[PDB]
From Swiss-Prot:
This is Reticuline oxidase. It catalyses: (S)-reticuline + O2 = (S)-scoulerine + H2O2 + H(+). It comes from Eschscholzia californica (California poppy). Its EC number is 1.21.3.3. Essential to the formation of benzophenanthridine alkaloids in the response of plants to pathogenic attack. Catalyzes the stereospecific conversion of the N-methyl moiety of (S)-reticuline into the berberine bridge carbon of (S)-scoulerine. Glycans are attached at N18, N403, N451. The gene is BBE1.
Amino acid sequence: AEAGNDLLSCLTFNGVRNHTVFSADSDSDFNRFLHLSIQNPLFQNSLISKPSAIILPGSKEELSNTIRCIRKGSWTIRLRSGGHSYEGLSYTSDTPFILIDLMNLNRVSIDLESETAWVESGSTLGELYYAITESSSKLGFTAGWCPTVGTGGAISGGGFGMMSRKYGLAADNVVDAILIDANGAILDRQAMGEDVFWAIRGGGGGVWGAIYAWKIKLLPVPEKVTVFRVTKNVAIDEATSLLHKWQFVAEELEEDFTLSVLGGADEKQVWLTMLGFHFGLKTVAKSTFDLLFPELGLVEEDYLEMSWGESFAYLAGLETVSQLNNRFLKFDERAFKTKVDLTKEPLPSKAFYGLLERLSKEPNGFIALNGFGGQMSKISSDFTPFPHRSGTRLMVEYIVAWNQSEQKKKTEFLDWLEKVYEFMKPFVSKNPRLGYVNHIDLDLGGIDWGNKTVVNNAIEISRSWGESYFLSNYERLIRAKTLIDPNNVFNHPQSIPPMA
Ligand SMILES: *[C@@H]1O[C@H](CO)[C@@H](O[C@@H]2O[C@H](CO)[C@@H](O[C@@H]3O[C@H](CO)[C@@H](O)[C@H](O[C@H]4O[C@H](CO)[C@@H](O)[C@H](O)[C@@H]4O[C@H]4O[C@H](CO)[C@@H](O)[C@H](O)[C@@H]4O[C@H]4O[C@H](CO)[C@@H](O)[C@H](O)[C@@H]4O)[C@@H]3O)[C@H](O)[C@H]2NC(C)=O)[C@H](O)[C@H]1NC(C)=O
Ligand SMILES: *Cc1cc2c(nc3c(=O)[nH]c(=O)nc-3n2C[C@H](O)[C@H](O)[C@H](O)COP(=O)(O)OP(=O)(O)OC[C@H]2O[C@@H](n3cnc4c(N)ncnc43)[C@H](O)[C@@H]2O)c(*)c1C
Ligand SMILES: COc1ccc(C[C@H]2c3cc(O)c(OC)cc3CCN2C)cc1O
Ligand SMILES: *[C@@H]1O[C@H](CO)[C@@H](O)[C@H](O)[C@H]1NC(C)=O
Ligand SMILES: [Cl-]
């Protein structure tokens, strides 16, 4: 439960010089490094579990040796890249643990010849994107709308982004990877085998080992794409109409179009931010939406043309493109709780109406609506661990957030969210209610790896969220887990169990 001369001497010997031991002092490097990448303030209070030590390996070898060193002791290993885990699963642990922060492993190498990039797993989506923009104005990538999200976790869980309707998930565009196993062995795709290389591409972070790097195929983008970020202030009726048509418009659009929705309310006043992206020019985009979705009341000045980088930065809400390269630019200072859904049937407008009413009851709540279809429909459900492909229509996530001034009311917020999730149950996927691993959710349960009764039955107990996240791919994920980590060194409350 301590740090100690053994671990410290082991690190020092292997020349892993960047590490600090636990200290409550606000002005200590330990505390500062700890809270640097805690992206959900819900897990920042003094009662939360703290790492005995934080290690910041500066290279692949330092990472391997770090893992080797921690292995010599009793600590649970925690890997943190961007720290965007909704449940703080990268910096918390029931058992005493060591925090391996990967923020120094944030280097990108772009190959304009192969049109691929080697990305150290501590790189955020923003840093990667920015690198790409620096190297090329014809190239881009897709992984999710949040620039401060680490590639290490996001790609490990998939990565559903602004252009996933054309290119699929981030994990779907990974051609190689350097993963460090429980024994510090450095393995490329060649070394790790196709089952493990399959598993790490969406199978969840903190399960298979430490991804040192991702070799991703860079994605073509026109010199100019078109976007619009337009907040509509309306009543619940018009909002209901708009969302109800939105599901169909968005799902049935070509792959060169992405219409996502942020939404919220406050009694009478319902706000809906429309985020539109067109793989192409303003004229084509505005024409397409003027025909297909004229009820949006989108005008000429709403559609802006810009580079891909500028567009992602714009829809993320960043002031400039350069802000992408800033990993500590907080997206939102508020502690949050978010649950997600995936639909296979179209939503009745009463689902949207109920959602909007509930949102009107709680101004701190909001929703995010993304369409699937397009390229997502074409990729086989077993190409990568992410199963929700053909037949999947919408990703509907419900978020509730609050500042510290509101922290006393925490539970209420949670309660509200719970109700929302219960209200949406009949209209969404069933048997099982589908989930998404990057949208990790402990309400679905959790494994206590200290309880050997549970551990003996780990697989079936984990099936509850396992089928939710992966469906039919769960079995192959288990085989892969058994292959790459039979001693379950990489575990968390919802990690894939090894075979018995
Ligand atoms: C464990 O890991 C942690 C996390 O990585 C480590 O903490 C990090 O430590 C970094 C230093 O090694 C530190 O980087 C610094 O970040 C600050 C921002 O807080 C930034 O200002 C610093 O940038 C200066 O230095 C770098 C080179 O080291 C230069 O590339 C850069 O241009 C800056 O130098 C210039 O600006 C300074 C003022 O900001 C001037 O004082 C300086 O003279 C210089 O000015 C010249 O260059 C300018 C630009 O060309 C020019 O305009 C001007 O006219 C002059 O010509 C630096 O990057 C990280 O902040 C820190 N990270 C965190 C999160 O804390 C830690 O070190 C590791 N621990 C161990 C044990 O190794
Ligand atoms: C905070 C946040 C998350 C978002 C946002 N938007 C998303 C989007 O538009 N599309 C998405 O598909 N997902 C979005 N998400 C969720 C993120 O995708 C997930 O939260 C990612 O898992 C976050 O990754 P990361 O930033 O690295 O957070 P961590 O807590 O460090 O990692 C999570 C998980 O993965 C393990 N892990 C971290 N690092 C590694 C390495 N390199 N190797 C193996 N495993 C790793 C951790 O242990 C942890 O279990 C928008 C916002 C605002
Ligand atoms: C169009 O694409 C999207 C855009 C924005 C989001 C919201 C984002 C978020 C935004 C916040 O402000 C926030 O407050 C703490 C928490 C969260 C967690 C959920 N999350 C993923 C989701 C999307 O899918
Ligand atoms: C292990 O889990 C089972 C099922 O929840 C429970 O009955 C038992 O008390 C637990 N044992 C320990 C050691 O906590
Ligand atoms: Cl993206």
